[PDB]
């Protein structure tokens, strides 16, 4: 079991860490069929999604996907600094696997 | 997968984007049977709903409808600026498909 | 579909609109068996309930009853102005069907 | 149906009202097995629990127990004044049945 | 039934109390499959997890694990002082069993 987001990210293929150390610039969410997702951006233009739940996800991830969208929304609204994102780089927009917040 | 609300909106028939760049003026929600819905307005009078769930919705959208009502309520209470709404034109009030929020 | 709380209220028998234009004065909730309910009051003493779920509710209302209690608690805690309540007047305390919030 | 917490409390055996008119001093919660519970204290030392869900509860209470723990956490974090608690006094710590909050 | 986190923690093997009396320094959350977890740190470098749900957990603990991640997120965002953690010491990072907040 990892102790931080960088080591967690390294337990997966097709992932990378992005260091933001910034608040979220915009928060988008959709209830439209087959596009039940969230998208965040940063002022540097960087865009990330929480993927639509699908075949790629194991059952244990379903609650965690919902939690992540909850986390992004409240981080956005409270202007919380996002430290790092672990993302999958075989999706466009890059898909969030993990988030760290500090400072 | 789309990277922003405008492109997402364009993936659906008979939708449009409204640009508000304003906080929500009023928030209404109902538990009354067959009217389990939310209604928001802006100061210009513009009125939008989250639809009552029905057969027009696929299963994957049901959780997202609930999340959207959560989002609208907290956006209202925090006076968060709503950037755009993607809506369906064939409902009255216009039915929300997606929301974006930015400073 | 209605566009505001007043029109929604009028789609039901046994209802009335209360215009409060005030924050909630007190919030009460109970987990006691057969009394799993919330009660709110306003400054003038006027009292309203979210009813115990029961056979007078259809299945689609169960989630909306839980949402309404969520709404009333956060409205109370944030001192959000309640504009109107739509209530059923064939219950004591008057039973909330819908709420609108506006400053 | 009762109009207030005092009248509600009187509908049950083994209960009493505590009039606190104070914020919560401490909030404790546990996920440990068979001790999935919350405990609050007040500055006067008074201590209360939300009981572990069990055989003493009917199914309609399960969602209300979870809601109560949510309420106590947010009341704690926002320093909301608790007016009264209705508690079962045949338990140690005294077990919360209902809460009222007023400025 | 215990009356405080210290006595609760002593009902379990392989647990200990850490006294922090500090806000959470960082909050990390993951939706990655098999690492659906949260990690917190304190400025003294201490690191704790909420374990991935699994067979070491009885069914009643699953809702309480979700609640705990909710609690840690909002405690982080509000800079709430954590008084004590009860943690299992047979896990790395040490795994949270209970939390207390005061002052
Ligand atoms: C890389 C990949 O295809 N991942 C998909 C995963 O495949 C499993 C194994 O991949 C890892 C991984 O995702 O990196 C390997 C990591 O070590 C694992 N880490 C931990 C901490 O457990 C993760 C983790 O278990 C899963 O992610 C949890 O769901 O899995 C992959 O190496 C393995 O490959 C097999 C191959 O399939 C087989 O034919 C060949 O003979 O042997 C290879 C091993 O040498 O296959 C594993 C599945 O059996 O599978 C999951 C579903 O279980 C997803 O499909 C995952 O795809 C990504 O999913 C992401 C969201 O969760 C996101 O959408 C990404 O864009 C997807 O690529
Ligand atoms: C009035 C009443 O007893 N309502 C109960 C309802 O009864 C149904 C019809 O009532 C309405 C209503 O609630 O006003 C009629 C509205 O037009 C409907 N509006 C919409 C937008 O759909 C609603 C709505 O469909 C339901 O509320 C959704 O569950 O229903 C009622 O008129 C009808 O009885 C007529 C009868 O047909 C007629 O021959 C005779 O002359 O008079 C009767 C009384 O007007 O019966 C319908 C049911 O078959 O039924 C629901 C559940 O099925 C509830 O029991 C409802 O009671 C209210 O419930 C509220 C909570 O949802 C709240 O607790 C109130 O205090 C209850 O009275
Ligand atoms: C007193 C007691 O042991 N209560 C347990 C309950 O027993 C039922 C009757 O209790 C009441 C009550 O809890 O006060 C009586 C009230 O009038 C009811 N009020 C309303 C508004 O309905 C409540 C309510 O129905 C239940 O609480 C909902 O679940 O129930 C109890 O009096 C009765 O036993 C009588 C017996 O009938 C009589 O012949 C003899 O002379 O005296 C007995 C004791 O007074 O038994 C009823 C059930 O058959 O049952 C529930 C079931 O889930 C609980 O076990 C309840 O225990 C309390 O539970 C609380 C949490 O819900 C909390 O943990 C308290 O500490 C428990 O004591």
CSV table of C-alpha atoms in Angstrom, one decimal, chain A residues 56-101:
chain,number,residue,atom,x,y,z
A,56,UNK,CA,-12.8,-0.6,-17.8
A,57,UNK,CA,-13.9,0.0,-14.2
A,58,UNK,CA,-14.1,-2.7,-11.6
A,59,UNK,CA,-17.1,-2.7,-9.3
A,60,UNK,CA,-15.1,-1.3,-6.3
A,61,UNK,CA,-14.3,1.8,-8.4
A,62,UNK,CA,-17.9,2.8,-8.9
A,63,UNK,CA,-18.3,4.5,-5.4
A,64,UNK,CA,-14.8,6.0,-5.8
A,65,UNK,CA,-15.6,7.6,-9.2
A,66,UNK,CA,-18.6,9.3,-7.5
A,67,UNK,CA,-16.6,10.5,-4.6
A,68,UNK,CA,-13.9,12.0,-6.9
A,69,UNK,CA,-16.5,14.1,-8.6
A,70,UNK,CA,-17.7,15.2,-5.2
A,71,UNK,CA,-14.1,16.1,-4.2
A,72,UNK,CA,-13.5,18.1,-7.4
A,73,UNK,CA,-16.7,20.1,-7.0
A,74,UNK,CA,-16.0,21.1,-3.4
A,75,UNK,CA,-12.3,21.7,-4.1
A,76,UNK,CA,-13.4,24.0,-6.9
A,77,UNK,CA,-16.0,25.9,-4.8
A,78,UNK,CA,-13.6,26.4,-1.8
A,79,UNK,CA,-10.7,27.3,-4.1
A,80,UNK,CA,-8.6,24.5,-2.5
A,81,UNK,CA,-5.1,24.2,-3.9
A,82,UNK,CA,-4.6,21.0,-5.8
A,83,UNK,CA,-1.1,19.7,-5.4
A,84,UNK,CA,-0.9,16.8,-7.8
A,85,UNK,CA,-3.1,14.7,-10.1
A,86,UNK,CA,-2.2,11.2,-11.1
A,87,UNK,CA,-3.8,10.7,-14.6
A,88,UNK,CA,-4.1,8.1,-17.3
A,89,UNK,CA,-2.4,9.3,-20.4
A,90,UNK,CA,-4.2,6.8,-22.8
A,91,UNK,CA,-7.4,8.9,-22.6
A,92,UNK,CA,-8.3,12.4,-23.9
A,93,UNK,CA,-8.9,14.5,-21.8
A,94,UNK,CA,-6.4,12.8,-19.4
A,95,UNK,CA,-8.4,10.8,-16.9
A,96,UNK,CA,-8.0,11.4,-13.2
A,97,UNK,CA,-6.9,8.4,-11.1
A,98,UNK,CA,-5.9,10.3,-7.9
A,99,UNK,CA,-5.7,13.8,-6.4
A,100,UNK,CA,-3.6,15.3,-3.6
A,101,UNK,CA,-4.4,18.6,-1.9
